[PDB]
């Protein structure tokens with residue numbers, strides 16, 4: 001490998017061999033059907049709300065999130081980079097698709113598949129990823145850096161449906177070598193959303209832009225229709241000319257054929273026919289190809305950028321609503337703007353690389369932090385773009401704001417699940433705070449919505465009211481229904497009786513004020529009525545008059561199957577913290593009566609929480625369950641947020657420290673030797689709590705949250721040891737193969753529940 005000298009991959013990048021077979025992979029541990037797309041994954045391409053495309057470490061464009069809210073795992077085999085090389089003095093060259101695999105649909109048999117093992121590496125430090133190609137039969141070594149411009153505090157380029165592929169080629173040999181690099185792409189108009197005639201009317205065009213020092217050649221893959229539907233728009237691929245390369249292209253090859261129309265050209269001399277052909281297709285699938293050819297002398301390096309864009313301006317949800325995607329603010333809504341997006345990328349990618357470096361540098365340069373932590377911190381961020389992210393720029397057919405939503409996950413297809421976002425929204429408040437405040441305003445606006453229509457609760461078959469006035473919703477809808485319009489899509493349980501949602505809501509509001517500098521009084525004023533309503537409504541659920549809402553021994557908080565009854569450490573502590581936050585907001589907004597009342601409620605509740613739950617070593621799980629003395633990893637969730645919010649001690653420092661040390665000693669170190677995170681419940685005899693499946697699970701996002709709480713309490717070693725098990729399981733050779741699909745949970749056997757999950761974004765709470 002002579003090429004990793006010529007590029008700049010950070011040591012904290014996650015790495016795997018191209019074509020590597022992973023032997024330990026985990027699978028779902030539930031009986032019901034659940035997504036398992038395998039370990040062949042990579043860092044995604046695409047901005048927020050753009051739809052994303054997962055290109056895997058084997059090279060294939062395989063995890064398709066272009067239909068907003070959906071996960072479709074299928075490799076589109078035509079979509080590839082290929083190489084040709086010919087050593088000066090040899091009669092023939094060699095051509096090779098850079099894909100460690102071969103088609104499963106019978107097509108493109110003429111292409112040279114099966115990129116060999118042990119001949120290159122994949123690296124990822126989101127939003128960047130790289131491939132290196134170090135192959136005994138390719139004398140010129142190649143690398144590519146691929147990315148989308150995902151940039152904190154930037155709401156423009158971060159939205160773009162674009163990717164850049166910056167190639168580097170180096171000749172370590174003593175002979176001249178002819179080299180070509182070819183990007184192929186299928187005209188994917190009709191891949192989803194089109195109910196009949198999926199290819200019909202698709203056509204490809206070639207654009208040559210000859211600006212001084214900025215020559216671009218691109219293919220635009222569109223459809224003859226001007227219909228404004230989710231399916232219609234354009235793809236584009238292209239390249240920018242650099243000194244010493246030439247460009248060639250082929251506008252139309254058939255993807256539902258053997259591929260030789262293209263490949264016989266490429267395999268001869270690495271030069272395409274430059275044949276333009278705008279004829280629309282009927283049934284056949286079609287594609288385009290853009291190539292560069294160059295001669296490298298001994299010792300020579302050259303760099304050349306390609307790009308990909310997708311202008312699919314409309315997202316449709318299953319309940320019928322159609323919305324424009326965010327990037328249309330910058331490029332237009334008519335679906336005929338792929339070239340403009342591509343051109344912007346090819347002309348500005350160096351500036352985008354610097355912007356990414358500038359944001360990653362403070363962390364990367366901090367030599368106190370281990371590399372593994374950096375690997376996880378950056379790579380968990382994949383989910384912000386990959387989680388079905390919806391970011392609207394108007395309803396189709398007809399505002400100041402752009403509504404936003406991130407899915408909980410794909411298996412549980414709910415936008416912004418609040419009990420989860422309490423953990424998973426750290427990166428948004430830290431890095432894209434304007435989006436975070438918009439989401440919270442969305443929740444504020446729902447507080448007094450009432451929908452008295454009844455739904456059947458999935459778990460027990462009881463009927464319940466959809467939305468109760470004064471109760472925060474579980475979620476802002478489903479991609480299968482109507483995001484932002486119809487809330488509480490979740491029906492497996494009744495969230496109107498949950499005991500955590502209203503307290504978490506208030507905590508999130510105050511967090512969002514504190515972590516953006518304690519200056520945004522207008523945000524506190526917008527949300528204040530909803531905060532007061534939320535706490536007042538939750539107070540009504542205190543049936544024994546101890547000042548604390550009572551868990552009911554039935555599904556009533558985020559651990560939906562783990563029954564809490566009476567006062568719980570979890571809900572009780574969140575309540576205490578939410579009261580303290582609201583007192584503070586009352587002081588800021590000069591609402592005396594609120595300050596007065598929430599202080600009184602706090603003092604009573606604090607005294608009783610401590611009396612009811614403090615056992616001398618830790619806080620009991622609850623007051624009334626058979627499992628009341630379980631040690632819960634999340635028992636002091638409210639004090640964790642109180643630390644972040646700078647609200648001081650809700651519980652005594654000594655008792656918090658004892659409890660955290662107990663959780664480390666038990667839930668971490670007695671669970672598979674502390675190598676897999678914090679199990680949720682452990683009995684005081686050191687045996688995992690078997691009262692419910694959730695007690696026997698590690699929750700990745702709970703464990704990262706626990707690690708930040710330990711860190712803030714000076715338990716540095718325990719904090720990183722605790723987090724390390726989650727990193728190991730996710731990313732390491734000894735783990736279970738969950739990279740770019742971190743799950744909610746795993747059991748002690750390492751098998752998982754709910755891949756591609758929002759909660760582990762809580763790792764960013766370790767950077768507070």
Ligand SMILES: O=S1(=O)O[C@@H]2[C@H](CO)[C@@H](O)[C@H](O)[C@@H](O)[C@@H]2O1
Nearest residue numbers: 412417419490492558559560744
């Ligand atoms: O009912 S679920 O399967 O439970 C999931 C998690 C627990 O893993 C809950 O916290 C969340 O509120 C639910 O929307 C999910 O659907």
Ligand SMILES: [Ca+2]
Nearest residue numbers: 542546548550
């Ligand atoms: Ca009570």
